Design a protein around this ligand. Structure first.
Ligand SMILES: COc1nc(C(=O)NCC(=O)O)c(O)c2ccc(Oc3c(C)cc(C(=O)c4cccc(C)c4)cc3C)cc12
Lengths: 11, 232
């Protein structure tokens, strides 16, 4: 649930 | 005598242009690193394997805009979901070669109209190719493409957004700075600014049909790459 997108945004 | 960019606008143009160039595949080396694809689910396979790096470059582009970074992550998620396919489409359309009648994807794969269409995009392939063809006489430079990307990224009308007005303010900055650059560039095309705004609508329609077709394309979901599913 946006977990990959969330990871890529907060790096 | 139409207004040319302010100093603040020139700084914004530098920021967004540099963000675009740093995240545009083989910016320099795309024409030569390009290989033509020969000849459904099998082109689905080469097109799935390349979508994920294309999404990632869009994410990188957004993350180099300081305006984007002051937004809450849940708004960033909505904005990126709304504009990946519009930006990726634009990035392919400006890489139309009339001679080969190809678009280049990921700075490396040249596809034809039939390849992209049979490959799985359907009528949206015709929409992206016809945008590429009509962008030829526009002669868009890196700055104009970056500003088009910034304008699509900063869409307030995206459903679920918290900072709807902060976003519209950011967009209005990019739009003003973009028009001023256009006034300054003096393209030899009548009503260039009104016509570029119509191209923005063309990309927004591509954004919504990709959405429409993804619904219809569900073919089990573990077959589609994870990040693609996140950005529908
Ligand atoms: C916008 O145009 C595109 N641009 C780029 C790109 O690199 N742009 C240039 C640049 O960024 O410099 C791509 O890499 C694309 C990859 C697939 C694609 O279109 C699709 C195709 C040709 C098939 C399907 C599918 O059938 C499918 C279904 C589920 C999952 C997946 C990954 C694919 C979906 C899409 C978006 C469209 C792409």
């Amino acid at each position: 649930e946006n977990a990959l997108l969330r990871y890529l945004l907060d790096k | 005598h139409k207004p040319e960019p302010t100093d603040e606008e020139w700084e914004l143009i530098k920021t967004v242009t540099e963000a675009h160039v740093a995240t545009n595949a083989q910016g320099s080396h795309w024409k030569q690193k390009r290989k033509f694809l020969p000849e459904d689910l099998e082109a689905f396979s080469h097109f799935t394997k390349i979508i994920t790096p294309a999404i990632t470059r869009v994410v990188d582009f957004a993350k180099k805009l300081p305006m984007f970074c002051e937004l809450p992550c849940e708004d960033q998620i909505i904005l990126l979901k709304g504009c990946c396919m519009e930006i990726m489409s634009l990035r392919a359309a400006v890489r139309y070669d009339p001679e080969s009648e190809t678009l280049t994807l990921n700075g490396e794969m040249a596809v034809t109209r039939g390849q992209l269409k049979n490959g799985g995009l359907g009528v949206v392939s015709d929409a992206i190719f016809d945008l590429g063809m009509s962008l030829s006489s526009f002669n868009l430079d890196d700055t104009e493409v970056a500003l088009l990307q910034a304008v699509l990224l900063m869409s307030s009308d995206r459903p679920g957004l918290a900072c709807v007005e902060r976003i519209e303010k950011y967009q209005d900055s990019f739009l003003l700075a973009f028009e001023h650059y256009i006034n300054y560039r003096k393209h030899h095309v009548t009503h260039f600014w009104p016509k570029l705004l119509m191209k923005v609508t063309d990309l927004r329609m591509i954004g919504a049909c990709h959405a429409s077709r993804f619904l219809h394309m569900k073919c089990p979901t573990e077959l589609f790459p994870p990040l693609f599913l996140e950005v529908f």
